């Protein structure tokens, strides 16, 4: 995250670190969205420009956590995978379009102060809040810069960007299954989501019932907190039906 | 989840954290 | 990255 601050404790419970086995490392963001299920993006899972496509044995995902490089006792919950599903027309050849994931747990996650899940939008929460203008947030253990590390999970809270002003600011083609996200430049304040935050979630806080939503998975960009660019972040709502499908069959 | 969404330390207590007024400033 | 309790790992 650039030009964000500090998470606060317990603040984003939902907050899930995607860690590598072997070299163990991070690999991405996610969030949960019930005992047993993860969100993610499906480029965090597979993208084969780059040769990647984990199996479930190459990965773990810990959750409840704050700072980035320790094991936080007591605290944290690390958890195995049972299995991966990754959207069927999730297209990594051209734009990322359907970028979105999900990982099944082993066993279930205990809640506590520091674990807890996200609501996932219905279609009128969406209609309602899903407006240029109106903020959301970002959290990630990613880079502090596009060209360093975060001691502890940083947040950053983004306006939506009107349609065109996304399209108009990238020659990649976008699709109706992703919204973005960040300031103008004449706006002056900044913030983006950056390398190692892929994967997280975008939250809104619902002012009919208080509840926080995950809008948005931190998805792509061009370089991070550059003038004119905005982050794109797949559109949760828009894929729900895939969501409620795999849960309901798998689940 | 029927719960999910309120934070333990934030919604569940009545406490807010320290920036998420600026959402609810920009629902306009 | 401090290393993980190898319980996890296995
Ligand atoms: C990803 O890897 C799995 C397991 O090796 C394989 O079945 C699948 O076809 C791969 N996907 C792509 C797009 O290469
Ligand atoms: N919003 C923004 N500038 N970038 C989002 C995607 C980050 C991705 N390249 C990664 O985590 O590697
Ligand atoms: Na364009
Ligand atoms: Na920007």
């Given at each position: 995250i650039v030009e964000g601050s500090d998470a606060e404790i317990g603040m984003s419970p939902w907050q899930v670190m995607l860690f590598r086995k072997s070299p163990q490392e991070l690999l991405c963001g996610a969030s949960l969205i019930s005992d047993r299920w993860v969100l993610t993006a499906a480029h965090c899972l597979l993208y084969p420009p780059w040769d990647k496509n984990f199996t479930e044995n190459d990965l773990l995902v810990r959750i409840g956590k704050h700072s980035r490089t320790r094991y936080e006792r007591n605290i944290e919950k690390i958890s195995m995978?049972?299995?991966?599903?990754?959207?069927?027309?999730?297209?990594?050849?051209?734009?990322?379009?359907?970028?979105?994931?999900?990982?099944?747990?082993?066993?279930?996650?205990?809640?506590?102060?520091?674990?807890?899940?996200?609501?996932?939008?219905?279609?009128?929460?969406?209609?309602?809040?899903?407006?240029?203008?109106?903020?959301?947030?970002?959290?990630?253990?990613?880079?502090?810069?596009?060209?360093?590390?975060?001691?502890?999970?940083?947040?950053?809270?983004?306006?939506?960007?009107?349609?065109?002003?996304?399209?108009?600011?990238?020659?990649?083609?976008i699709t109706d299954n992703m919204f973005c996200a960040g300031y103008?430049?004449?706006?002056?304040?900044?913030?983006?989501?950056?390398?190692?935050?892929?994967?997280?979630?975008?939250?809104?806080?619902?002012?009919?019932?208080?509840?926080?939503?995950?809008?948005?998975?931190?998805?792509?960009?061009?370089?991070?907190?550059?003038?004119?660019?905005?982050?794109?972040?797949?559109?949760?709502?828009?894929?729900?039906?895939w969501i409620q499908k795999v849960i309901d069959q798998f689940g | 989840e029927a719960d999910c969404g309120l934070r333990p330390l934030f919604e569940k207590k009545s406490l807010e954290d320290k920036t998420e007024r600026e959402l609810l400033e920009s629902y306009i | 990255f401090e290393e993980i309790p190898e319980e996890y790992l296995q």
């Open positions: 995978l049972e299995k991966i599903y990754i959207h069927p027309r999730y297209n990594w050849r051209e734009n990322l379009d359907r970028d979105i994931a999900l990982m099944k747990l082993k066993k279930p996650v205990a809640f506590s102060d520091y674990i807890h899940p996200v609501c996932l939008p219905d279609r009128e929460t969406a209609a309602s809040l899903l407006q240029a203008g109106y903020k959301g947030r970002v959290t990630g253990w990613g880079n502090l810069k596009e060209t360093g590390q975060p001691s502890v999970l940083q947040v950053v809270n983004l306006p939506i960007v009107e349609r065109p002003v996304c399209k108009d600011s990238t020659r990649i083609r103008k430049p004449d706006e002056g304040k900044r913030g983006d989501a950056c390398e190692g935050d892929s994967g997280g979630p975008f939250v809104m806080k619902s002012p009919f019932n208080n509840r926080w939503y995950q809008m948005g998975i931190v998805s792509w960009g061009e370089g991070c907190d550059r003038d004119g660019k905005y982050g794109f972040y797949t559109h949760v709502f828009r894929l729900k039906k | - | -």
